[model samples]
Target: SDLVKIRDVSLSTPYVSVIGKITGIHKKEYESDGTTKSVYQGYIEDDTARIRISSFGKQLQDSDVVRIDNARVAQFNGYLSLSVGDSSRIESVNVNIPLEHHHHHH
Candidate 1:
C-alpha cells in the first residue's frame, strides 16, 4: 500500500493515498455563480494524527473508514489539509486505529 501517514503529510507532499476514519462530517450550501453548491468538510484521523479534509460534491459519512486516493495537500489557515480533486477517488476500506472508541448502550 502506497499510503502516507497523516503526520508525514505536508504542503509540499505530492498526490498520495491516505486511509483514515471520518471523525466528523458536515455539509454547507451556498450560492456560487447564481447557482447553489454544496461541499463536505470534516476531519480525518489516521494512526498518526487528524487533519481537515474537504470534498467538493462528494458526501462522506461520519465514523466510516475510507481510503482516499490522489489526495492533494493544500494549505488552509496556515495549516495543511487534504483536498479531493476531480480526479480523486474515495473508497470504503477496513482499517484499525488506536483511538477507535465505541459506546454500548446498556
Candidate 2:
C-alpha cells in the first residue's frame, strides 16, 4: 500500500510507509533467543494519530520528522503497532507537525 494515515492502519494492512515525528524513544538491551539485542521502543505521530513503534537496531532522535517505509504491522499487548525490520527504511525528512503543541502542555 501507499502512504497511509496512522489512524487508517489495521491488523490486516500490508506494508506501508508513514511520515511522522518521533515523539519519544528509549533504548534497552536484553537477551533474546540466546543473543543480546538492543531494541528501541517509541511512539510516532502524524496529524491523524499516534502509534507505538519498535526497531531492533534503527533509531531516530525524538522530535525528528522521518519517513518510515516498508514497516510491518504487528500486535503488541493487544494494540496494533509498527515494527521496523530488515526491509524497513527510515530517513529524516522535512515536515510540519502541529500536534506537537498539544504535547507541550505541562
Candidate 3:
C-alpha cells in the first residue's frame, strides 16, 4: 500500500493514506430508560488531516499512530473523511518504521 499525507488526499479517489499523531480522545457514556451506550472521539493529524474518529464498543486511546486500511470515504459539511466500521482494524504502528509493535506482553 502507498502511504500519503492527509493534506494531499482527494475526495475523487476511493482510498488514501493518513499518517499523523493523535491529539485528542473523548470517551463518553450515556443512559436513558435503562439503556446505555458508549461513544468516543479520536483526533489525529500530520499537519494536514485533522480528523475526528469515533467508536463505541472499545475506547481508542490518544497518541496512537494508526493506519486505516481500505477505509471508505465520506463527506460531511465541506470536508473529506475516512470512516472505520465495526470490521475495521484499529492498530498501533511504529511511526518511524511502519512495523506493528505490541504494548502488552500477554
* Window of ten residues with lowest summed lDDT in model 2: 95-104
Question: Which residue pairs overlap in candidate 3's backbone?
Answer: none
lDDT string, candidate 1, 22-56, tens digits: 87788888686999988788999976889999888
Give the Cα lDDT of each candidate.
0.84, 0.84, 0.62
Candidate 3 Cα outliers beyond 4 Å, as residue runs: 27-39, 47-49, 56-58, 94-106
Model 2: per-residue lDDT, tens digit, 1-106? 4799999888778688888888778898879899999989889998788999888877668888888898889888998888888778887876554565676656
Candidate number achieving the greatest TM-score relative to the actual structure: 2
Give the distance in Å from residue 29's predicted Cα in candidate 3 to where it truly belongs. 8.5
TM-score of 2: 0.81
Give all TM-scores, in the order shown. Answer: 0.77, 0.81, 0.58
lDDT tens per residue, model 3, 3-93 = 6667655666565555556657777777836889776656768655576555556566677766765554567577666655566556677
Q: Tell me, what's the RMSD of every candidate?
A: 6.4, 5.6, 8.5
Q: Candidate 1, TM-score vs. the true structure?
A: 0.77
In terms of lDDT, which candidate is stronger, 2 or 3? 2
Candidate 3 vs. true structure, TM-score = 0.58
Error of 2 at 64 (Å): 0.5
Model 3 residue 74 lDDT? Answer: 66
